[PDB]
């Protein structure tokens, strides 16, 4: 298990575009192409996103890099941000993936209110930031992703994803 498996697992692959589980426009491997309820300017932005006249559909290829590049800013986002760099600077490998996850799947505004959490986190109070993290609406909207989620920030382990 990696960072990529971990989020295909998630995420899922699909090629044509899709509302994710928002309601929100999004193609690949949980590209999120915009909020707009409007079809037209999401095929627009996949036409912008991948160089070329896609019609709303892409190869395993071009989805693979969206991910690539994704993956990739979910991180640089991170250790950009004031807030997320000490403590995801304090976790060992398989718990800093649980972070990429998280910010990939809710954006740094996503995580904003995660300030306790992050604190118990920083303070390896794995079970307390565990119970933390599961009372927000991102456990609620999505239990099953955020369980797996939590468990790998809770015990460091890839036991959630098999
Ligand atoms: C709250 C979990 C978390 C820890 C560290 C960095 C980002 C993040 O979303």
């Known amino acids: 298990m990696n960072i990529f498996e971990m989020l295909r697992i998630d995420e899922g692959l699909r090629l044509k575009i899709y509302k994710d589980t928002e309601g929100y426009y999004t193609i690949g491997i949980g590209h999120l192409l915009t909020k707009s309820p409007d079809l037209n300017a999401a095929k627009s932005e996949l036409d912008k996103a991948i160089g070329r006249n896609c019609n709303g559909v892409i190869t395993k290829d071009e989805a693979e890099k969206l991910f690539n590049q994704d993956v990739d800013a979910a991180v640089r986002g991170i ?65 099953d992703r955020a369980k797996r989620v939590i468990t790998t920030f809770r015990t460091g382990t890839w036991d959630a994803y098999k």
């Open 79 to 143: 250790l950009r941000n004031a807030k997320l760099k000490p403590v995801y600077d304090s976790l060992d490998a398989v718990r800093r993936c649980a972070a990429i996850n998280q910010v990939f799947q809710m954006g740094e505004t996503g995580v904003a209110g995660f300030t306790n959490s992050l604190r118990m986190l920083q303070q390896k109070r794995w079970d307390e930031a565990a119970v933390n993290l599961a009372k927000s609406r991102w456990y609620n909207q999505t239990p």
